[PDB]
Amino acid sequence: ARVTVQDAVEKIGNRFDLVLVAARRARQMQVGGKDPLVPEENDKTTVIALREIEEGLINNQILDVRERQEQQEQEAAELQAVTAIAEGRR
Amino acid sequence: HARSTGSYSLVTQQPLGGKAQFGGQRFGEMEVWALEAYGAAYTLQEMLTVKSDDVNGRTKMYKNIVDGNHQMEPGMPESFNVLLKEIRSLGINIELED
Amino acid sequence: LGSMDAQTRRRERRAEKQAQWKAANPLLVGVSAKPVNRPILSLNRKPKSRVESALNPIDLTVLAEYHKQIESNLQRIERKNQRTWYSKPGERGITCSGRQKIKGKSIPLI
DNA sequence: GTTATCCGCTCACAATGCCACACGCCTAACGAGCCGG
């Protein structure tokens, strides 16, 4: 479980970037199906999101870098699928 | 007295009040001042729109909870359209731009 | 000698089309209505005389009597029921009270 | 004279939130209905 919040507000900027960044991380962890970095302790996604914030492995720059990287890999992989279709046609 | 999902009124699509009629509590005006006084923004949006007066929003929310996905759909409250339709009952044009 | 049809002169306008296309081609295959789906009903009409239908037209008087009987019986029964169910109480008033109340339920909205 | 002010009279508009509980929300006379005398 988790009681305090003040280990994150001194890591991310204020008490308002923390809400949006941790909500975005928990939303892509819950439904998008990604595996968490630190191990769970049978907690919910909000608490494990705040834990990954306060240790310092999830940040807004880091979220946009990872999303850009995996999305570029996604469009590159479907371009590879299109070139595989082009190999299969001719 | 408690309530998860009960009945609704006729004119405005709000839930009823009271214990006997299986009602919800009046999250009144001063509590809205209190939530504005924090930095609470999304919680005010649920207490204003998803919990009441957005019909398609609240049924989408209920299905979305049972499916196990916590999203929300903002929408627009039906009571505001009521307000528009009884200002237009006077001689007052009032519309929405864009 | 009229030939005052629009489709006729329009076909004559496109006579080069039907001259070019119908080179070793048929002209038209258009089916009509067939007498299979037409009952002739011509077995006998000699006793079907006009003066005998004049003396004997068709009749549904028994239908009107039956319908009037149904209406009169239903009016008597409904008049008796609306006579002894909405009566007026006398000099003292309604001797009871309705007292009906409806509570609420917990109705989900899936 | 006439003009620019000062003052008294009259009138619209506000007065916390929530809860339960409980009982109330037309009719003397104008258009129809039944059938008796």
Curated annotation (Swiss-Prot), chain A:
Annotated keywords: DNA-directed RNA polymerase, Nucleotidyltransferase, Transcription, Transferase
Highest taxon listed in the record's lineage: Bacteria
Annotated Gene Ontology cellular component terms: DNA-directed RNA polymerase complex
Gene Ontology biological process terms from the UniProt entry: DNA-templated transcription
Protein name: DNA-directed RNA polymerase subunit omega
Gene name as annotated: rpoZ
Single GO term (MF): DNA-directed RNA polymerase activity
InterPro entries reported in the protein's UniProt record: DNA-dir_RNA_pol_omega, Pol_omega/Rpo6/RPB6, RPB6/omega-like_sf
Reaction(s) the record says it catalyses: RNA(n) + a ribonucleoside 5'-triphosphate = RNA(n+1) + diphosphate
Enzyme class name: transferase
Pfam families per UniProt: RNA_pol_Rpb6
Subunit details: The RNAP catalytic core consists of 2 alpha, 1 beta, 1 beta' and 1 omega subunit. When a sigma factor is associated with the core the holoenzyme is formed, which can initiate transcription.
Organism lineage: Bacteria, Pseudomonadati, Pseudomonadota, Gammaproteobacteria, Enterobacterales
Similarity comment: family membership: Belongs to the RNA polymerase subunit omega family.
EC number in record: 2.7.7.6
NCBIfam families in the record: rpoZ
Role according to the record: Promotes RNA polymerase assembly. Latches the N- and C-terminal regions of the beta' subunit thereby facilitating its interaction with the beta and alpha subunits.
UniProtKB/Swiss-Prot annotation, chain B:
Membrane-crossing segments per the record: none
Domain of life: Bacteria
Function: DNA-dependent RNA polymerase catalyzes the transcription of DNA into RNA using the four ribonucleoside triphosphates as substrates.
Subunit structure: The RNAP catalytic core consists of 2 alpha, 1 beta, 1 beta' and 1 omega subunit. When a sigma factor is associated with the core the holoenzyme is formed, which can initiate transcription.
Similarity field: Belongs to the RNA polymerase beta chain family.
Protein name: DNA-directed RNA polymerase subunit beta
Full-protein positions shown: 1244 to 1341 of 1342
From Swiss-Prot, chain C:
GO biological process entries: DNA-templated transcription termination; regulation of DNA-templated transcription elongation; regulation of transcription by RNA polymerase II; transcription antitermination
GO terms of molecular function: bacterial-type RNA polymerase core enzyme binding; DNA binding; RNA binding; RNA polymerase binding; RNA stem-loop binding; single-stranded RNA binding; transcription antitermination factor activity, RNA binding
Alphabetical list of InterPro entries matching this protein: Antiterm_prot_N_Arg-rich
Disordered as annotated region, ranges: 88-110
Coiled-coil boundaries: none
Leader sequence segment: none
Keyword vocabulary terms for this entry: DNA-binding, Transcription, Transcription regulation, Transcription termination
Biological role: Plays a role as a transcriptional antitermination factor that allows the virus to initiate its lytic phase. Activates expression of the delayed viral early genes by modifying host RNA polymerase (RNAP) into a form that is resistant to termination signals. This antitermination function requires the host NusA protein which serves to stabilize the interaction between antitermination protein N and host RNA polymerase.
Subunit structure: Interacts with host nusA.
Protein name, UniProt field: Antitermination protein N
Organism the protein comes from: Escherichia phage lambda
Lineage of the organism: Viruses, Duplodnaviria, Heunggongvirae, Uroviricota, Caudoviricetes
